[PDB]
Design a protein around this nucleic acid. Structure first.
Lengths: 347, 347, 348, 347, 271
RNA sequence: UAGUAGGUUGUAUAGUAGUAAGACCAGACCC
RNA sequence: GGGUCUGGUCUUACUACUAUACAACCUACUA
């Protein structure tokens, strides 16, 4: 089997997600909210924040993937258009990561199997922990495959350490959250270039993942620059920021935002609440009264950021640098003075 | 069995009402409308005009009674509070005639059988064309029973000739629309009083049902009164109406409204769109510019109204007359100008 | 008292409009509809088609004017911005004719009396059948006054014969629907221009109001033109209409639309459902398959239209003619050639 | 172009449809209705009855095709999935006939030209009155082409006489509403089979289109059979209908419905308000009280129906007959008594 | 009395709850929100999260009980179906704890007094701090009574130490939040058996994996997410716990906050 | 007199439209 | 080659709307 609204609500009530049990419960759809009657009183089960109909969005939310899955930004950068026999929920915007589905909900389904002709001109995300998906990826024309282990006859590409698990990114210890990515286009397997992976942290629950990051949060700016020999790279304004004018200077790394937040609180108004490698924020410092309309914040490991920034050479005043991050090219606007660097920020 | 939204929509699509078949179709609930996907495009199936949730109202509408059923005004006057194992749809206001149901929809059910203790202090409408309902009526404490035939041990009460059938009232020829009404209160059968029944007609599809009505519509105002000897009974004002002042005079019978509508069109704004024995209208005559804020219109057979007015014994100046219409008392405001009648209109 | 939602609903239930009685009834506001509980079941009382909140629109609808009132187009053309101590309901779009009110609903009120300073730079519609309104009009700076009779010290202006009464326009017989209009601007009484008044009819309930209209509805096109000496005025196109090409021809008078509708049914899609002197329609003829995207239809008495079309010389290649209709200037495009008119249509 | 909501509303206000002019007007989107401010008061321009967003549906409605276009049922039967550079509005359900568009609205566009790779595995409706569309049809892989005239190198297929024009079907006189249909699948032109075309009439504005229909609407049931020699074809029940039992007998042609409506009014509740060759109705006769839950009504010319019924032979008790109507197969359930056909109704 | 929407909004504006004052203020009902006009600009007063109409829910919210009241789980376990002359607001789901009311709001009222025949086959929650309610409980057929003190002729049952007060549970010091529970069924007083009472704490404001104390200890150690897929109030809570450090998650986790059939909160819990 | 300015009108360079007609180009049908 | 019908463009005459520049009239605030 039954694929109906009341069976989905029964599964949500008894297990929190659509498992596949048999049963039905009373359901009331008023406004965009789905209520259920428990002990004679209506209890809210789901509030629709999406653009889909109420029952369609509820069914997709209940059938979401609860296993560790790749972050939505990785899938978007890899060009994934649809997911095979699963729903990947984008918790950043509280909506499904993909408009259509394959064999999940009859209202949004374009097919019941990923091997149909309609699914051929689409990059389909194939899981690896579900049996039989590797064969479907081999027979698919366009598809992206993730695997905990290794696949015979293919060259694995190491992905990010962290992965999304019910909306909270983590480096799994009990469960393996590091996958191997395979991309197949037009029936030909394509290798993927080596890329630096964003750590996807947050200001509140910020924890350094390296010794250099620990020194950045604790040691002074001059001491940290002197110890690691970061002179002549404009590290004062690129990371720490300039809270002295009406507009901020630099501050394009999430680690600098975390350091400033620990020093003085401020507001990060995200005017595009989605998940992406590069985030734009409406930052307003509450102490110095300095605000910036657009602030491109990219969360990178500090050691790899140093390696990236020191592998471009100081020879021209201005240059555009293309860096492969999350399997996509990132355009960095680089300004260089003579002897030192002026400014290096993402576009 | 399955009791779900998609099975109900499948039954509506394939048969127009909930029959009890097995199947499911895609359903989208957006706004108060229930859409279904037919040939890849959404088709509207039901628009909620009720005060209930969208899916609850849709399920009640699909499970409505399609057999000839008594008019909602008769049930309200008899004091019916709930219907046993059926839904009676009030097409006048496009909502169920009763707030709760017995064994129909889990969201509105108060019980699964009419014999439970919760249903005891309620007048339950028991059908007669469904097997086993007569026994339930006998065992019920408060209930109203309708029967095409006769029931042993009970005195039948003849009901109205017409009955509702999918929202259009008719005097059935192929199907019997005349029932026998039995009312049982506190376990004791009560014999219903002798009463007149409203014909429940409309101005557009108005057809006379007696010789007197045909003469009323065909003959002039003076000719009709002279032929039937209605002098000194205010038939000109009460029935025909007086469109000569800023406010109307009389016009409290639907037959007079039909005659005027055939003569000159006008607007009847019903500010309480429900079904009742006495209707109040905001009548505005479009020819003479005469309007009346409240106009109590009661549809009665002309012969019965003549009998009622001739039995009034007009001797006192003012008197309140109680007339049993549709198993309920109707308060008629009677004014008599000593010698003849002054005005006789319902309150 | 009391000015509350439940008292308003009680008045609607017991009398159909807000009279001023004391009482309350259960009320449920869900969606844009206002329901009431009668005999244990919810009954719909009002569905909000306006741009106002549900209870605000319900209160304005209940307090609407039920007496014969001037049509909304006349008020808009006269420049009326607000109504004094009343609500004028625009039944064409099922919303109040004016955004704000004076002493009606606390949510929309800008004042409690029309004599306040905020109401001074506004043209206020003052009634005449309500006692004391004439004095307010005299003391007002900008205002429009209607009166069944005559007012001392002022020159009356005769208005249209018909007036709106609960959404249906009529030439009242029992009740006088013809008023005298007075307009006062900046404390100085202004006389209103002499004008022709639109009859405001409809295709379904269309009834001729003159001998010429009866002849038009009965006689053939050629016979009517011959009888009324309308030679060389494009009456075949301007009025009767030309359903011969892909686009329509002329057909800019409602009487011609009524004649065609009686001949062959068609659809008039009104893409701006409001009330105005000149109406634009998306007419699609169902017989010949001829449709026109924009069709300016103005309802005028056929004698008045004949006089208007005979009052303009036709030697110029083209000209824009301004005609005072419903106290406003209507622009007519006079595309003519060699004396005989080619077309004559308003704009909207 | 400018493609914005206010430009679309300006075009609607000044011309009734999106022509392509430059300008803007105030717009208010509250509920599903789009209002505009004219002379200081909001005027409703469009009420959304679709499943699309308010502004998307408004833009599609304004950019609809106002020229004579084929009826939506013909396009659905031909398998049209999308329309090239135009929007075909389905006035029966007040929604666009196709979910996606090509180069019309950026919210629903899948491409800007019909020659892109994404549009290749889709049957695209190509007009013929727009210059350059014939070349696109020739270069297209899957597409349907209509032409007023003839196309060199292709065999024309004569379509229906009538065509939709702003929601009202008509046999155009001033404008040609008869097209020639060409279907191309997988780059190979397919000839369409000879077929019968539904006249697509309605009960209210019903006008006979042949001598036989006039005789049917005037002559008696027995006289009409005698004159046209229809004995042993169950013409009494198939077309006229039988209002004698609880359920109707036959009445599967719209001409019979029109005749009955002229005789006695009744209600046709369409529980699937869409456009299709075969329509199912919830017919309830208001005179005899006879109702039928499902009534398959197909509007065919009486001469064509006679030709169909006289070419099936009377040899088996039950048989399924496939008839090509509107370029699609119609399944007719045929029951034959030994000697004469018993019941012949569409499924 | 006056019982109208504008009087209720006036009471909310001037006192925060329906006290019973006389007055009216402009009110706008758009969407499910009730706005009021203060200084010429609309100010939101109430957003409807319930299944009731906007004005009905607003009137019930304004007429809610602000005194210390028993927790909703205790009332549900005791079988309370309706409250006499008061509204008990369930702050966990932001909706009234009972579908119908007695003499509060005309849209939801089934009666004006708890002594009517319609209220007889219902367990009615009778207060004890309101004068005259004890007599109504004595005359009632089915009802539950709470009392700060003692009632003559009845055996008191000691209830939980904590009680709800404007949505925050507390062990009252200035005000007594410990009541004595009396249950009367079919006109016969039934004694309440001994039972253990849930402390009803929370992880954030916790002051001394199926016990809430273990959840609090883990939260102090490592943060995690508790997705409550049934946001209501009950003795036993099911959570969708996902540990953010070890990546360990459990779909259903029955968490009961305590200091085989077990008598907890006047009901039976099966382990 | 030296400056900063809101409404009305005119001139100049421009860009769209207008429910009539004529002309040019292109396509279809017929002779 | 001619006639009719459609898609695009120009002209006929008068007006409406948007953009910029300058001037005049009624006049507003300072030295």
């Amino acid at each position: 089997l039954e694929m109906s609204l009341e069976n989905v609500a029964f599964n949500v009530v008894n297990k929190g997600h659509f498992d596949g049990q048999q049963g039905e419960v009373p359901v009331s759809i008023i406004n965009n909210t789905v209520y259920t009657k428990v002990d004679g009183v209506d209890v809210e089960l789901f509030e629709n924040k999406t653009t889909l109909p109420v029952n369609v969005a509820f069914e997709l939310w209940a059938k979401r993937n609860i296993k560790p899955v790749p972050e939505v930004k990785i899938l978007n950068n890899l060009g994934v258009d649809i997911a095979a026999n699963t729903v990947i929920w984008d918790y950043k915007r509280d909506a499904p990561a993909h408009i259509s589905t394959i064999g999940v909900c009859s209202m949004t389904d374009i097919a019941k199997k990923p091997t149909e002709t309609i699914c051929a001109p689409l990059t389909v995300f194939f899981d690896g922990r579900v049996d039989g998906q590797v064969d479907l990826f081999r027979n698919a024309r366009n598809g992206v495959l993730i695997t905990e282990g290794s696949v015979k006859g293919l060259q694995p590409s190491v992905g990010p350490k962290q992965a999304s698990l019910n909306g909270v990114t983590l480096i799994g210890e009990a469960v393996k959250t590091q996958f191997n990515y395979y991309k197949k286009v037009d029936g030909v397997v394509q290798q993927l270039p080596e890329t630096y992976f964003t750590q996807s942290r947050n200001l509140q629950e910020f924890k350094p993942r390296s010794q250099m990051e620990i020194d950045f949060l604790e040691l002074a700016m001059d001491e940290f620059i002197e110890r690691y020999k970061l002179e002549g790279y404009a590290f004062e304004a690129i990371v720490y920021g300039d809270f002295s004018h009406s507009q901020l200077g630099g501050l394009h790394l999430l680690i600098g935002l975390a350091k400033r937040f620990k020093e003085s609180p401020f507001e990060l108004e995200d005017f595009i609440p989605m998940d992406s490698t590069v985030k734009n924020y409406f930052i307003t410092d509450a102490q110095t009264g300095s605000s910036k309309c657009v602030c491109s914040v990219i969360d990178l490991l500090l050691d790899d950021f140093v390696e990236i920034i020191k592998s471009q050479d100081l020879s021209v005043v201005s240059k555009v640098v293309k860096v492969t991050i999350d399997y996509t090219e990132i355009s960095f606007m680089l300004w260089c003075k003579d002897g030192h660097v002026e400014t290096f920020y993402p576009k």
